[PDB]
Amino acid sequence: QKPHNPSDPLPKKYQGMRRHLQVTAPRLFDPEGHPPTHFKSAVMFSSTHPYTLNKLHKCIQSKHVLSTPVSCLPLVPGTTQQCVTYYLLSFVEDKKQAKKLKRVVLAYCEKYHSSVEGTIVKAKPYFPLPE
Amino acid sequence: QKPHNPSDPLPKKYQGMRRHLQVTAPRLFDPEGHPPTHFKSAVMFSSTHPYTLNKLHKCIQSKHVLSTPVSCLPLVPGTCVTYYLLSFVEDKKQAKKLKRVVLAYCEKYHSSVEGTIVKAKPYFPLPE
């Protein structure tokens, strides 16, 4: 896979969520300023739906929040009673931003993408994002 | 992006590292014992070399350690792709163990590979 290119315009379908995120969390989606020096935190967004996280991958992108493309979690051996769970990581500066991003994204998703779950994640000393 | 199949055999070229992991950290790579109830921790292994991570994706697999397939990290605005996988483990103790062991091997044979300790608050959304 290859990472998202910010310059690419959003499809119309995704514009609703993006606009909502810009209004609700304007500091995390402010097109101005410099990205944070370190991304010590992230929210893992997960869903059993294979395509719902595509929307999140495209919408949850700015200078202050960087999202991986959609991948999938590993299977728990050797259960057959399970399904594939898909996920992405939305990297942010600190836990404070992560809690905020989770809350805001889930609030939107609880109504329209209810299978989406969020998990606050933390790295030490921070995440190895290419510089 | 399809998850690792534990029922599938390992290609010969990966068997070496798997054997090394089995011998070095037997408690993480042994079929015996009880798998973790929660996976609270992970090691993210990252590298600009995707084929190397494909090796780690297949080799770093057991009932006690669960690695995602290889994906990639986003670019940091204001700039080559960096790839990653997550290896999920039980707690930070296992994560430190896994990181030291994998990086000891990679230090000589795959020097591009980096490891970062990752902690989920409160756990990773893996099934019970």
Numbering used by the authors:
A (entry chain C): 130 to 260
B (entry chain D): 130 to 208, 212 to 260
Please share text taken word for word from the publication where this structure appeared.
We also solved the crystal structure of a C-terminal fragment of MHV-68 LANA, mLANA(124–260), at a resolution of 2.14 Å, where a detailed structure was obtained for residues 130–260. It also is a native dimer, and the fold is very well conserved with kLANA. Between the two LANAs, the regions of highest structural conservation contain the entire β-barrel and the helices α2 and α3. The angles between two neighboring LANA dimers range from 0° for mLANA, 72° for the kLANA pentameric rings to 90° for the kLANA tetrameric ring. Likewise, the mLANA 4A mutant was incapable of establishing latency in the spleens of infected mice.
The KSHV latency-associated nuclear antigen (kLANA) and the MHV68 mLANA (orf73) protein are required for latent viral replication and persistence. Importantly, kLANA and mLANA CTD dimers undergo higher order oligomerization.
